[PDB]
Amino acid sequence: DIQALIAAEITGRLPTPDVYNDDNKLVIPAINTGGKITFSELAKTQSD
Amino acid sequence: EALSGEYRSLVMNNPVADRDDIWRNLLVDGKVSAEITTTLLADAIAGIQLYINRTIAGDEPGADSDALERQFFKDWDACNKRYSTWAGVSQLVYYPENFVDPTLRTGQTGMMNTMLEQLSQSELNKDTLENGFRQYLTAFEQVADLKVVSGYHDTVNINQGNTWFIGTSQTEPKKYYWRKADHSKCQNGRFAANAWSDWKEITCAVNPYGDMVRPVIFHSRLYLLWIEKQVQKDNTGKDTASFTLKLTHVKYDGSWASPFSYDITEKNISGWKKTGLYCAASQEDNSLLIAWYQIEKETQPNSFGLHIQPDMSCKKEPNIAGILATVTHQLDTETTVRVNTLLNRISSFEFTLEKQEGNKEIDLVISHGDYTVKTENSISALILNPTAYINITPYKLFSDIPIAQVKTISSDDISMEIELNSTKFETITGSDVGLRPPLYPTVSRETLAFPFGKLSITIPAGADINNLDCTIKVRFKNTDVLAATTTYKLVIKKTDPVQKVISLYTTPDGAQYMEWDGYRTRLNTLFTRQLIERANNGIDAILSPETQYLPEPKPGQGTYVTLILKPYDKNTHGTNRAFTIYYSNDATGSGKFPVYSGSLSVTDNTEVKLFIPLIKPQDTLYLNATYQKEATKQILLFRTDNNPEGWTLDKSVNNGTFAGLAENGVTGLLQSGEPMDFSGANALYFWELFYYTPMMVATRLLQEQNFTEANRWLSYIWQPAASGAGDWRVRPLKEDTSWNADPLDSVDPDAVAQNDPMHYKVSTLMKLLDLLIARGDKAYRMQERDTLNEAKMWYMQALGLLGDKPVSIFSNGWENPSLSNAADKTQAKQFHDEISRIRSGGLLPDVANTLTGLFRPQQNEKLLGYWQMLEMRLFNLRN
Amino acid sequence: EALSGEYRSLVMNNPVADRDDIWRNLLVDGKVSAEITTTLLADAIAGIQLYINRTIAGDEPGADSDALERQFFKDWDACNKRYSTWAGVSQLVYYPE
Amino acid sequence: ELFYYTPMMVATRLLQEQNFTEANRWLSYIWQPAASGAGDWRVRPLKED
Amino acid sequence: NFVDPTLRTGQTGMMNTMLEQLSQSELNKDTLENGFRQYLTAFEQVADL
Amino acid sequence: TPDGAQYMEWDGYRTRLNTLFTRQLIERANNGIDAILSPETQYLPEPK
Amino acid sequence: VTLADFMPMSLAEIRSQNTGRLSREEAQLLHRAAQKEKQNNILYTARMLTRANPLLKKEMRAEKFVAPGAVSSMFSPAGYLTELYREARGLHPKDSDRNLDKRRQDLAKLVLSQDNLDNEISALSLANEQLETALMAQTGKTDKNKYYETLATSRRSGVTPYNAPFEGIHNALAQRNFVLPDNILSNPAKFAILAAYDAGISPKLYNILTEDTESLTGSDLENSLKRNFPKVKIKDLMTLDALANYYELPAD
Amino acid sequence: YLSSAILSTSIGVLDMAAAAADMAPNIFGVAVGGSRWGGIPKAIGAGMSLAASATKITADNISQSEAWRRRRQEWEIQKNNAESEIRQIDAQLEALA
Amino acid sequence: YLSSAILSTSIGVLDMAAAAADMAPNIFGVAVGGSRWGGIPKAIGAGMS
């Protein structure tokens, strides 16, 4: 059940409804070999 | 309905078409009601299945017949037609334990059959459970005591074909049995354990004289053959002795025919002493050459022959001392026993595949079915195969009736014209066959066949038979408009493969072995001479691992050698990680025999142990190795005395190292005895006795709910160890011993699990899980308090056995590929190519991402059933 | 549930542990419902039985192998594993009738 | 008998008792669908009436 | 409409005994092949006459 | 005939009595029912 | 490499490709070698995968194991469909009119996703989508509603003159058990058309059935046949099965 | 039945030893002879007939035990019938109360 | 039961080979003889049984 949350957050649309609202970054996990969860973040410029 | 009408009116351009033609043309049913719901993959599957059925039943003309003649479609209806049976068959390579039934197994011996018969009642108390095992053990002892009397090798090259053996029992009267050793499962002088058949009894009453029994394969059928001596008395006081040759064979139902008999006594075999008989089939003039000959130090001072036609009629061979003269390497002597092979052809035929082919559109290749030479003429059987595919220009292309060519009758179109030394003789098929292969089935790439009936081609005359008998060529011509010719050359030449001898021995301490070209194969086992003392302590002592480590005399004269080798170094081993180690005698240039092949390890010493036989009769022996780089230098192994285990460690001036072992570890040179073999000739009997019998009795007590005894019988196989891992009490499981080299030639789980006994480990643990869950359920239905605690105990034990539930990843590297990107041929070729590279150890892996290609391996749904059952029962217990 | 979480956080020093590890380490099941009633000797018995099973199946490493190779544990599954068959086997010397 | 009446008997005898995947195997000793239009009769006297 | 693949007039004793041995309910490949090997033994004998 | 065939020869015809099918079936029969019942078994030749 | 390319092929395919290069016995040896290598490779992978058995983890490449019913599982309907497609897409030549890809162009684009494998759709809706994507490709129009509007007046088959809107009206209206020509509120002078709509008859079907075909001759009859049978040839329609399939009525 | 089948297969040894003993001549003197040439084939046949008899005996044994197992299954069904009828009659008594 | 019936019919061969072997004289010397004249009818009967 926690894996369902993690999976729907990594591929689906979670957190509902929007994301990325943390100082123009984004941190999304990445699970592998069934026994770890690693992280990899995004960034952006000051457009608009 | 409206869309379908307009579809076939506009797109299909055939408004009168039925609406089912939309179904057949578009692979979707439109006449369904609005409630029939299916997934989308399932609809694609149903569509492609309908398509494959219609194209395999001919309703979709123009299919690739070559593709339809392919294993996937050949196994279409049986396996691949429905998802159910496709999945069930595909899982059988990976989870055979799901389908292994411990009671019913293919190739189950008659002993195990009769034991299962006697355990098939409901009252299995210790008395019946021990009587059954004592009876099984009596039968096992009898089939283990069999000593091989004589053999006969099927083909003429002793590296191919089968070797039939005749074994006798250590009783009185003797009972004769027969096996078969398939040499097509024999690399490096090492028979796969499944290259051997079961010992099967000869029910006829065979009462040989002086141990003269011979198997022989006459028209693919096993014949037995022995000489029977019977004491008589003349009318006068003199008391003679009459001899009879007896001959029988297996019928199709495995019974033995009533033996024919031929009176043999003619004034001379009565006079011999220590005679022996010979028997071999003939590739020319299908008959049986039988021959009894006198034995001395040398073979055959005198010998009488006999020929037998398939009507089983005597025809005395008048001059056989000349025929036995060529095969004297297969004949017995006063001290050796040699198996016979079939008779060589006097003249070996060879067919150059082509000289010229003419029109390079029709392949027009022939194939000489049978070929031989009679007393004066060479007969042959020929079949001719053209292409006859699409693009015969111009087109119509409506109908084929079976400016352009002949679409009509194809009479006398093909013809063979053999060219003799100076002459030629031209036969056309209009003179042979009334059957004509029609150009219809016009559908493309269908090839045809033109069979010729036993062309007794006359006549080779004025030619030296057979010294300069190489006829120039054999040429034929599919003469037709736009059609061609090809020609073949007949290269008959008299040959003589000499002294390829294959013999049987028996060491003074009991061991037998068949010694062929440069190897030795142990035939019998001395296990029963030592089991006899264990057997008085009971089943617990018969089935304990100390019984399975019992030693065995070494086959003949030779040494065991335990070669230890260094890990893979790219410099000394070349690029490929595989290695094969040879031995020789060695008159360097006398040929060396590959005695072991393997994949040399990385970051670890690999230890290969062998038995190097002494066949040459300072007994020299020279071991090599062969890598991708080059073949290393020999290593002398010799001895000074006649010690049987004495073979000099670290022989003379040579360095004593290949440069691949480069350590002080070579020796293993003592130990006149090796352990009992679980992948040799008698592998089946040992595996039955030590694994398949306890598993059968345990699964047979689990059913009928004898849990405290089912556990006792499983604890003959596996028993939990105080350390982490379990204690496997079956030797070939403890040291994973593959004993089925070719397991995918049949849809059976036991072959796979024999090829990889880790599946027998998993099957055993699954039976144990069954047992624990059943004890838990039994105690859980007696609903009182202490029994509920006991049930929770049994379930907790099963959980501890299973371990930790494997978490199922869903955020995985599985993208969502399209069907076309998932069904590529490059996708399968790359996968299998990398596997075949990493399997021959071409180099180390890439380091290590993908093992099974695009689709991931699945967890055993049976194990998940165990997990779920335990969680459910434990939930109900806790609540 | 709360006590078990805090137990493996503080005592076992392994907060990520499963709650069944408390069962295996403490020989008592906590996931039972509040209606499961047992006596106190019976709970001690079930605890020592779970302990002996786990140490005889190797899940409790470091056991005395010499002690495990002893008649009581050699006849473990057949006789001494359950009170039923221990009592029934012990009575057989005294009341064979 | 050997070439027609035996496979037909074994096929009708497996159809009864509902062994379909083997009844089909035994009928495919007689008739077998061809990639061309007409079926492939694998019994010679039927193939040539 | 009336041909019964099992019962036929003039059916040989060989075919009779094979149908006899296929008349049980468990027709696995083992019995189905043993029956045919036995039929084939009898057939071989009546063909060698 | 010397090669096995029998025949009853009456006024001006010959009727073959036996068959040599079993001398050739014996080799097909080792490959199994699938080889015994295949059409190649049914086209087997016969001496005249 | 070599023996890996001949694993999927059959003996006839091997014999048929490089007819000049491979002999008829070399081809058979190569086919046997390919099948044996395929079997050995499958055994190799299965043996390395059975080391990761949860029951044998106490005695120990455990890379990825997916749950049963996952679309990425090698035993799932997605793997079955991949096998079916790989083996079936090459049965007819690509130019042939029976080729699988050419007759179902949506298969090669089909994405093997868990949502495709799991989500239930109506089979009839899928049939209708399949027919629409072809009919609109023929007509050239991409709008669905504009296409049905052109479909509402056309007479190019015995089932075609149908209105999506009128059929909706009629069904919705007969679901109220409402009878049009029995309204107090109507034009009693329009009872004919009202009872026609009550029986359920498109306006175009009414225009069809009210023509005066009886006693209509000359080039006018030619006009009328070209109007009422625009796509079918009358002689090809003459037969009984054709009449039963054109009007979607039983032949008997 | 099991003891009978085992006795029936443990007699081929004796029947063949009898034939092997009969193969030796028993008439001596000016006329010698008396062996029984067909003794050994006859004894192999007699052993076959005993194996066939014991095979039918063990088949009857299995059939018997299976008949008893099907009997016990019928009995379990009947016991469940009556056991559920008890629950139904108790619910009926509660409705009456 | 099937294996039993097959064993019971696969023994006439042995029972007839025994009679054919018994047809040969076993008493030699000044008095010759010892054949069993009824061996073959008896063995045919035993095979029938």
Author numbering:
A (entry chain E): 292 to 339
B (entry chain A): 921 to 1322, 1447 to 1661, 1674 to 1903, 1906 to 1937
C (entry chain E): 921 to 1017
D (entry chain B): 1744 to 1792
E (entry chain B): 1018 to 1066
F (entry chain B): 1551 to 1598
G (entry chain A): 21 to 80, 100 to 291
H (entry chain D): 2083 to 2179
Paper excerpt:
Tc toxins consist of three components: TcA, TcB, and TcC. The ~1.4 MDa TcA is a homo-pentameric bell-shaped molecule that mediates target cell association, membrane penetration, and toxin translocation. TcA is made up of a central, pre-formed channel that is enclosed by an outer shell composed of a structurally conserved α-helical domain decorated with variable receptor-binding domains (RBDs). Cryo-EM structures of Mm-TcdA4 and Xn-XptA1 in complex with heparin reveal that the glycan interacts with different parts of the shell domain, including receptor-binding domains.
Since synthetic heparins/HSs are difficult to produce in the large amounts needed for biophysical and structural studies, we decided to work with natural ~15 kDa porcine intestinal mucosa heparin instead, regardless of its heterogeneity. We obtained BLI curves that show a rapid, concentration-dependent signal increase upon association and a signal decrease upon dissociation, indicating the tight interaction of Mm-TcdA4 and heparin. However, we identified additional densities at the periphery of the shell domain of each protomer. This shows that unexpectedly heparins do not interact with an RBD or the neuraminidase-like domain at the tip of the shell, but directly with the α-helical domain of the shell. Although the resolution of the density does not allow to build an atomic model in this region, we flexibly fitted several heparin oligosaccharides that resemble natural heparin into the density. Indeed, most of them fit well and their negatively charged residues are involved in many potential electrostatic interactions at the interface.
